[PDB]
Design a protein around this ligand. Structure first.
Ligand code: HEM
Ligand code: HEM
Ligand SMILES: Cc1cc(N)nc2cc(-c3cccc(CCN)c3)ccc12
Ligand SMILES: Cc1cc(N)nc2cc(-c3cccc(CCN)c3)ccc12
Ligand SMILES: C[C@H](O)[C@H](O)[C@H]1CNc2nc(N)[nH]c(=O)c2N1
Ligand SMILES: C[C@H](O)[C@H](O)[C@H]1CNc2nc(N)[nH]c(=O)c2N1
Ligand SMILES: [Zn+2]
Lengths: 412, 413
């Protein structure tokens, strides 16, 4: 049970001991594997639920600074112990906060970009009290992370849950996303994935330009209050016009995308403490836009339009016109970003980086939890090295977790 | 207990009750998922054999709507006495056919299972020698091939008894190309087959030493040392690969065989183990175009193809690899269709499987599926299986992996 993982392209074999420190459960059993389930499974921590969680976290922390078993360690354990017995919760030291966040990223088994995990910019926003205040922290995040196209990793951490009545939440799924409107006649204009949220905004007071690439407004909820709309200043939203380096007609498709991927609907858990609002951001892998955002049938779905322009034989599937078109689109996305000097990585580069990162983690940590179903890119799978890499998936803490959408729960 | 799966593209939700009939184990635990391990670890006595027999017979007679009948009870009784008396038992023909078909049906890594009920089962349980094996296999190949109009088939050799008298096909597939390790480090032919090739040569094979030499059959009967046989070339249907627009593609000198026929797996039915049971269907295009040609550890022709297309091969973000892969796959499909050899593209096959899967949820209560393997090795998310949640669990009858015989065999000499 000190498990081994093989790379079948290189015969490299790695021994995993880190999985033995796993806390939470996977959702698999000896009888059934649920590795392809998108999301397997009021609850405020009780007093005695929280001490062991806090102790577990402080133990890793003081080991990581080579102070395990020290006076400083013991003192802190005691101090937090006292504070929970007293206040029914506790507060992280800035240093612990930063360690917790960086390690939540390190432990994210579905993330392929984790080779960068130690270079995360952490913005402490725990002094925040209002949606306007939240708006301000978020604008600063966006401007810092964007950095004129030279993107930088960042997370902004708002106050922690207390009793579930005073939660901080960003209602958008990403800080920057295009709107989606269902036409009265056909299907959808803009981005179909955002049709419900685009409507909640409107139903909350937003006036929409009803274009195909309208940046959504922010819906910000502080201390469990009704949320508020804020438009992100356009000069803070860096966008890229999409053109092909060979096909002049590509520009005429009229497509663009934003440079900053910034997920804002997940929950960060450290030492038992729950941060329900913690937007984090990095930079795109090319296929996230080109393969998923543009070509998914339930998104922009521009494949047929493009194949048309290329004059491919769309009569039978065995001509592989979708594949051919798909490649060109993704060539264009990378070409556009690179030309405009906005940070982006191709799926070949990022998967190779991740193999290197796996190597490092097995060597200096004893393993690296990884979710094959998510790590392997949605195109050209087997000509990337992660395809032939066996991976073990297990859940370590600190972690990012999913949480219900606010509008289904909000005590309005 | 119910279990739901969701298709995230169509929002279709299905309910799995079949997983409750699962007996075997996955390799996963409460705290670890081993879903991407290629071969998880996941001589049998009468102690454990009659429960296994009873389970199978209960299934079998349920499917034919005779559960609890006299024919069912007498059959149970007959199998019981045969086991306590002889320490094994024999399957009737009907049972064997049901067995092989349900094994395929239960094969969670197989995207082609829509076809599972149309399997041609050849009973070679009266075979006793390697020569007899060679003859059964020749006939399999002739029948399956059918002049390019392929037919699914399986040939079943005698079951294991004491594990000292096993029937084995030492080839991983009935038809495969040689691989030769050259002194300078390079490989001639198929790198996947170098080790098996070396065995054949040792056993007295005279190697042509080309890049597409069909390997000889290495056949073991009754636990005896294996013998070489050459498949008659008129029986091996091959297809030269050309591209519909690139005239220089044919000059790359590629070809591939038409019949995929896997011969190293173990068929388990009602506790009985059939260690030699070659089965065949037809190719999905990506098996050849993506894995056989473009894997770095295989023929690895991406470079040569990228050069002739004059692609920007300097930085990878030009996606020259991705572009070359598509053209090669286009060529493979075009060539097979032109020669009227049965083949299916990954778009058609994944679509068929989603239909199969839905049908299996309705009429059977589930469909075990291994996402890691079902999703095609190129253009993943534009196929409908990518967005489909799947539960993976093991049912019997089943096909299992077994170790290479040259590692476990006791040599006679
Ligand atoms: C810096 C470059 C980064 C790249 C290239 C990257 C790439 C990716 C990709 C491709 C996915 C799959 C999601 C999808 O396909 O839609 C993913 C998921 C994810 N990423 Fe990263 N990411 C980066 C930075 C970050 C950062 C800075 C964080 C947090 C601090 C992060 C946390 C996560 C998490 C939590 C998931 C989902 C994990 C889960 O659901 O368990 N990523 N990332
Ligand atoms: C008729 C057309 C068929 C097609 C297109 C097809 C396709 C495939 C493919 C692509 C794989 C994955 C192999 C790889 O990617 O390396 C697979 C796996 C498999 N197939 Fe099929 N197959 C077909 C017929 C059959 C038949 C006739 C049988 C047996 C009677 C069979 C049994 C299996 C088994 C046992 C596996 C591995 C399953 C496991 O380990 O769970 N298939 N199939
Ligand atoms: C920081 C970051 C960068 C990036 N390029 N992609 C991300 C993708 C995610 C992500 C996580 C869960 C689900 C999703 C959307 C599902 N395809 C995205 C989260 C963060 C990301
Ligand atoms: C009958 C049949 C047809 C087909 N097109 N592919 C198969 C592929 C397999 C197969 C199963 C496990 C492993 C492998 C090779 C390793 N990728 C192939 C087995 C049977 C097949
Ligand atoms: C059903 C399946 O689990 C789902 O489509 C997953 C598959 N793999 C993925 N992988 C990545 N990187 N992103 C995704 O959104 C998904 N979707
Ligand atoms: C390590 C990994 O599980 C291994 O490379 C698997 C991945 N998925 C696959 N899927 C198919 N269809 N065929 C394969 O050979 C593999 N190989
Ligand atoms: Zn699992």
């Amino acid at each position: 049970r000190f498990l081994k993982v093989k790379n079948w392209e290189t015969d490299v074999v790695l021994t995993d001991t880190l999985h033995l420190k796993s806390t939470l459960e996977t959702g698999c059993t000896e009888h059934i594997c649920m590795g392809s389930i998108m999301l397997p499974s009021e609850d405020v921590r009780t007093k005695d639920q929280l001490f062991p969680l806090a102790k577990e976290f402080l133990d890793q922390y003081y080991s990581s600074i080579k102070r395990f078993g020290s006076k400083a360690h013991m003192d802190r354990l005691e101090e937090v112990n006292k504070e929970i017995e007293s206040t029914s919760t506790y507060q992280l030291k800035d240093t612990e906060l930063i360690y917790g966040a960086k390690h939540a990223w390190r432990n994210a088994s579905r993330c392929v970009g984790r080779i960068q995990w130690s270079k995360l910019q952490v913005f402490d926003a725990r002094d925040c009290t209002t949606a306007h205040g939240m708006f301000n922290y978020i604008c600063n995040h966006v401007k810092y992370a964007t950095n004129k196209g030279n993107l930088r990793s960042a997370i902004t951490i708002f106050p922690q849950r207390t009793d579930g009545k005073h939660d901080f939440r960003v209602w958008n799924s990403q800080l920057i996303r295009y709107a989606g409107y269902k036409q009265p006649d056909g299907s959808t204009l803009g981005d179909p994935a955002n049709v419900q949220f685009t409507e909640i905004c409107i139903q909350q007071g937003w006036k929409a330009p009803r274009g195909r690439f309208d940046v959504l407004p922010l819906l910000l909820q502080a201390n469990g209050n009704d949320p508020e709309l804020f438009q992100i200043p356009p000069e803070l939203v860096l966008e890229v016009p999409i053109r092909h380096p060979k096909f002049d007609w590509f520009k005429d498709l009229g497509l663009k995308w934003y440079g900053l991927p910034a997920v804002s609907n997940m929950l960060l858990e450290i030492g038992g403490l729950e941060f329900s609002a913690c937007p984090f951001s990095g930079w795109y892998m090319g296929t996230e836009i080109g393969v998923r955002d543009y070509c998914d049938n339930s998104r922009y779905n521009i494949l047929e339009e493009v194949a048309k322009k290329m004059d491919l034989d769309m009569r039978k599937t065995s001509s592989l016109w979708k594949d051919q078109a798909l490649v060109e689109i993704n060539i264009a996305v990378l070409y556009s970003f690179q030309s405009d000097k906005v940070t982006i990585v191709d799926h070949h580069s990022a998967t190779e980086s991740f193999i290197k990162h796996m190597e490092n983690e097995y060597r200096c940590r004893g393993g690296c939890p990884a979710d094959w179903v998510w790590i392997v890119p949605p195109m050209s799978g087997s000509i990337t090295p992660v395809f032939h890499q066996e991976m073990l998936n297990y859940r370590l803490t600190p972690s990012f977790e999913y949480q219900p959408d606010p509008w289904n729960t909000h005590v309005w």
